[PDB]
Amino acid sequence: GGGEQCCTSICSLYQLENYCN
């Protein structure tokens, strides 16, 4: 799809929390 980060790899709700705020 383009610049992905949690697709081919695997992050957690934390890395997802780094996108908020």
**Whether the Cβ atoms of residue 1 and residue 10 lie closer than 8 Å to each other:** no
Q: Kindly determine how many residues on this chain lie close enough to bind other proteins according to the rule CB under 8 A.
A: 15
Smallest gap from Cβ 16 to other proteins, in A, equals 4
User: For other proteins, what does the binding mask look like between residues 1 and 21, x meaning CB under 8 A?
Assistant: xx-xxxxx-x-xx--xx-xxx
Q: Which residues contact 6 (CB under 8 A, 6 or more apart)?
A: 15, 16
Residues forming the site for other proteins (CB under 8 A): 1-2, 4-8, 10, 12-13, 16-17, 19-21
